[PDB]
RNA sequence: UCCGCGAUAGCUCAGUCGGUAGAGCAAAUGACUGUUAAUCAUUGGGUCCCUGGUUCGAGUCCAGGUCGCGGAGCCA
RNA sequence: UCCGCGAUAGCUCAGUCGGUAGAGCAAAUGACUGUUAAUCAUUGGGUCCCUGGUUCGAGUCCAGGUCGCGGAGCCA
């Protein structure tokens, strides 16, 4: 039916006649000559109409925006003073022999025009015309191209595209599970998976050497800019491989992927320990595009008159880190206050600062209310260590380790972006050597990866001082965002029971919830380790998108609702009763 | 860590030493020589041990079934009288230099041996060792290879791998939807999709010319041998194409797929109308491997003494079809009774028959209680038309059209398999020219495809006598099973509202449930049509599997439960209350 | 919801007439240099799906219930 | 659950001091042979998120509620 795509009309097609189908982007009427910009998946082309055939002209005057039309005409090499740079087929035209309106179109709620600041609620309510926009279309086509490349790579390296079930068993240890009432088992529920974890491990026990799957995952947690309740994840699991082999394969994949699509190269991936990343960046996912760095300085603030410093400086559970931000002594007190509230949202009691103006003048030349409570010597070697000179300002996080790490960690990236201090485009890295556990506002512990992660120690050295236990885990970080990660799994069962005990799971749940896991571990489980990628975030980075919603066909709002389909919706009492449940108002 | 896979040890590797990791399939102990059959993803190999290195021997005597071991040895060209035909590396051996037990294994509940009639409940409860069996593994690897080929094809033809959301809006027209309580919208529910239908259509409106997706689909309906509650489906949708183009592309895909994997060719796909398929096979999915055929014969039974024949023979709403099954006059009355009950389960009041023994002897020579109520002439031309001779038997379905179609339709395939009358291996075909609607035990109508299917007539000729309306639908059938199908969609909105009205959906639901559809249709929807494949059934056919559960990693039971993970399970009252619901006992 | 079949050792299953528990395989131990579904011997192993009822007595009979398989309904 | 920002024509938004509704764009109509974000003119277009309360009077003020965005909690 169609001869060629509009956005694929080259100069070589001159003289030839073409039949193209598509939408009417915009129409320009001069009376004696009518212009149409016809759009399809490949781009836009221009069709011109003269009244020598007044019927086609009549079918050109009635045509409005976003009409679905089929045009047959001749490819005319357009004049030199009429060539369009933006249009890929802008050095060419089509004289319209015959036009047909395949379908009419009502006026599009928002324009598909250059720089129209719609308007995300409206773009989501009419997502089916929002994706008409070449930008969105390019993003989605890019996502498809990406998954194409990844699938190709993983297939070429002996991985098996295996599907794992969505309807699974509900357990109360991981993230909040979406529940599905069972019609056949009243009082029981299915649960949507956060990850095909247990299943992929079983597939390793099953003898499949290498498994991969681009799988749907579901978390009933609240949303954020890079977090959706329903997210697609690139699952990978292998047998008889250590962490070096795994990070090797996955890194190789990411490199090949970035070279196939964006055609970029990454030099090398720095392996950074968790401790270091927390020490000098205050984040488990450092943004290495920002040269700003946290520097410990509490060693010089032990016997100082200022008490909010010497407090945690002598407290082993906390620290006092400094943060030099350059040329910013000229900061208005307004901005300082904004930053103090900002570090406030992460738990910081306040935000001490030192404005450096003249270091040659000693204590004076250092504008700050704090400069009085700190001796000149300590002060000077602090400014020396932090690398500050005239014009800079040094912020201070002095509190519990977690608090200063989080507050200065976030302040770092914030003032990093606010001053545009990004030093490179792509900053890939590996965060390695994690702790095995962490405590959550309470004596309760939780694995910072997942309870199936292999510890470095033995099952005896684990239930004794679990805090000194390291995990065989590893995360991949790109431009401050977590591309993904994984770990080497437990296969000793005894060990698995050890970490299950230390996490508060007694043998009741061990048998009832994770019984099949222990079983599979006892019936000959091989050394296996894996990794997962957040496909959504990956595409968000590769496109350069602001939000995850920009790289998802039909995303959801912060309340996990879809404005286009009005989901979630109401269900009649019949189907509700059939699932053996009642509501409550 | 591993040098080579066990099942990839060729003769060329002779002399070379290899390190292979895997499971211990079975062990044979002769005392002075120990034999191990080591298995991995590629197959089995044999490792031999002599006591000249008694430590490795000690690590060979302790080893039992399904132990996870790593063996380093030398590839020895085994003697001629010891070569194994079944084993791919059976003309070779490995003398074990050093062995290491990577992990021990408890005795496998069922054996992984040749012809052990386990035992599907046990195979499902321990699915992680069931998939160790080379057969299951081969099935899954085949499935992966299939999806690989399909993805490759569709990608090569300008289709876009786009993901559609799982959490959608609940509607009460299609199949029973699985519901998901909303934590943020109390009293409202999400619903798992039966198909990405509306979404794929929106993606057609969105300007993406060609879309495909291997998507998860969910139906809360009871199960069968080829029906699961959670099934994977190959979704396809295109714009600006008619049914001929679509059936062309999809058929081309299936051909290429069958040639890439099984390396078979299909001659041509016969296009059979719905009416014909129902007339001479009594099924919308004919098994063309069975030469047995239904033949209308009611025209000869108008004024006959037998009343169960002449009843429906004069009734326009019903018919009298005959079914000749050859050489089966020798059938025991037991088998006849079994068949009568069998056609009984499909609504047939009974099952009249004629045993043909001697046609030269006239009415006698025809053993039957019915032969008395039917004149000799009519009888004889019936036997002539049905093609019966001495030794054959002719069954009769005389009832309402639906009843005889279903009962004889099923009897046909049953006696087709029971007598092994399969004439070819692959019988591909297209069933085309469906009716638009059908009534369900009630004045209520339902589209036999789906309410978005394009009718052949106009929106006026549709609300008037809807029974004379044909759909632009098409199904692909292989060996009697439905591989899939699709149709050309509605884009007139007026038409969509017409079929929505005739299906009992008032403008209330039209606005509330399918509002976004009508909207998208009004804002410039192109002529689009699509198709979907049941990937599960496809793999079931290509493998030659008995059940769908054989080609699914972790399938479910007839009550939609998983015996391995004990799903569905119970959830604590906290998470239950958080989703704003209560149970009832 | 309906029809039909089924549940006994780790696995496949027999178990009569209602009379108080068996085989093969597997496992553990033993012997053996060439088997490849190794052979051979010794030994261990029971919530007869659950719950009740009739019996002096229940794997066996009755009733209800649970689970697994095929089908009908259902599967736009 | 908490912090912050936000809702006015189809779209982007102004709306003062509480005084009874506006712009640009879009649409419909008109003119024009060369524009490419065409130009120009005429005309149409309001559930000021919802619900109440104070006022002679509410887009404006108060209270509760709904929705959308960023973040905290949360996200094994
Ligand atoms: N599924 C894990 C990663 C893995 O175990 O591979 C996660 O999402 O953190
Ligand atoms: N999704 C439809 C087929 C299609 O519309 O393509 C079905 O399952 O019957």
């Amino acid at each position: 039916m169609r001869s060629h795509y509009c956005g694929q009309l080259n100069e070589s097609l001159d003289g030839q006649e073409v039949t193209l189908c598509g939408w009417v982007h915009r129409r320009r009427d001069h009376g004696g000559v009518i212009f149409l910009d016809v759009r399809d998946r490949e781009g836009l082309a221009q069709v011109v109409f003269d009244p020598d055939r007044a019927e086609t002209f009549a079918k050109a005057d009635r045509v409005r925006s976003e009409f679905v039309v089929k045009i047959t005409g001749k490819v005319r090499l357009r004049p030199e003073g009429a060539r369009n740079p933006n249009m890929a087929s802008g050095s060419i035209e089509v004289l319209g022999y015959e036009l047909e309106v395949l379908n009419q179109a009502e006026t599009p709620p928002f324009p598909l025009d250059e720089y129209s600041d719609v308007g995300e609620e409206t773009r989501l309510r009419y997502r089916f015309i929002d994706l008409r926009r070449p930008e969105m279309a390019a993003k989605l086509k890019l996502r498809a191209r990406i998954t194409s490349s990844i699938r190709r790579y993983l297939d070429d390296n002996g991985f098996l595209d295996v599907e794992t079930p969505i309807l699974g068993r509900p357990t109360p240890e991981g993230a909040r599970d979406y529940l599905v009432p069972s019609r056949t088992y009243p009082g029981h529920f299915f649960a949507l998976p956060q990850s095909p974890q247990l299943f992929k491990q079983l597939l390793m026990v099953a003898g499949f050497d290498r498994y991969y799957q681009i799988a749907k995952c579901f978390r009933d947690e609240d949303l954020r800019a890079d977090r959706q309740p329903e997210f697609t994840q690139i699952d990978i699991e292998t047998s008889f491989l250590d962490e070096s082999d795994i990070i090797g394969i996955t890194e190789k994949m990411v490199r090949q992927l970035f070279k196939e699509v964006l055609d970029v190269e990454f030099d090398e991936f720095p392996h950074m320990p968790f401790e270091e990343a927390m020490r000098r960046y205050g984040s488990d996912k450092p943004d290495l595009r920002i040269p700003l760095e946290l520097v410990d300085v509490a060693d010089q603030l032990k016997e100082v008159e200022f008490k909010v410093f010497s407090g945690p400086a002598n407290d082993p559970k906390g620290r006092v880190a400094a943060l030099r931000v350059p040329g910013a002594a000229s900061m208005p007190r307004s901005q300082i206050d904004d930053y103090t509230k900002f570090v406030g949202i992460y738990g910081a009691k306040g935000l001490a600062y030192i404005k450096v103006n003249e270091r040659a003048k000693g204590v004076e030349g250092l504008q700050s209310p704090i400069v009085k409570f700190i001796p000149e010597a300590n002060l000077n070697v602090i400014l020396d260590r932090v690398g500050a000179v005239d014009g800079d300002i040094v912020f201070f996080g002095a509190d519990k380790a977690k608090i200063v790490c989080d507050a200065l960690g976030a302040l770092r990236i914030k003032v990093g972006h606010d001053l545009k201090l990004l030093t490179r485009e792509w900053a890939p890295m590996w965060v390695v050597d994690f702790p095995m556990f962490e405590e959550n506002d309470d004596g309760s512990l939780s694995a910072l990866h997942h309870p199936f992660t292999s510890p470095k120690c033995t099952p005896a050295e684990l239930e004794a001082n679990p805090g000194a236990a390291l995990s065989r885990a590893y995360d991949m970080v790109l431009n401050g965002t977590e591309l993904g990660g994984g770990s080497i799994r437990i296969h000793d069962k005894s060990m698995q029971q050890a970490v299950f005990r230390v996490l508060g799971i007694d043998e009741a749940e061990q048998e009832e919830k994770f019984g099949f896991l222990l079983d599979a571990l006892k019936y000959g489980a091989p050394p296996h380790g894996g990794l997962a990628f957040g496909l959504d975030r990956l595409v968000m980075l590769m496109t350069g998108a602001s939000s995850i919603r920009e790289v998802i066909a039909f995303p959801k709002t912060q309340s996990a609702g879809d404005v286009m389909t009005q989901a979630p919706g109401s269900v009649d009492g019949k189907a509700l009763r059939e699932l053996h449940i009642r509501l409550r108002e």
Side-chain angles (χ1 to χ4, degrees), chain A residues 195 197 200 233 235 449-450 485-486 489 530-532:
Chain A
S195 177
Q197 180 60 219
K200 83 208 291 196
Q233 199 153 255
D235 222 24
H449 206 269
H450 57 66
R489 315 284 187 254
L531 179 143

Side-chain angles (χ1 to χ4, degrees), chain A residues 415-426:
Chain A
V415 310
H417 289 300
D418 290 340
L419 277 72
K420 295 190 171 186
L421 287 176
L422 307 178
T423 170
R424 54 168 69 246
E425 247 207 324
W426 313 100

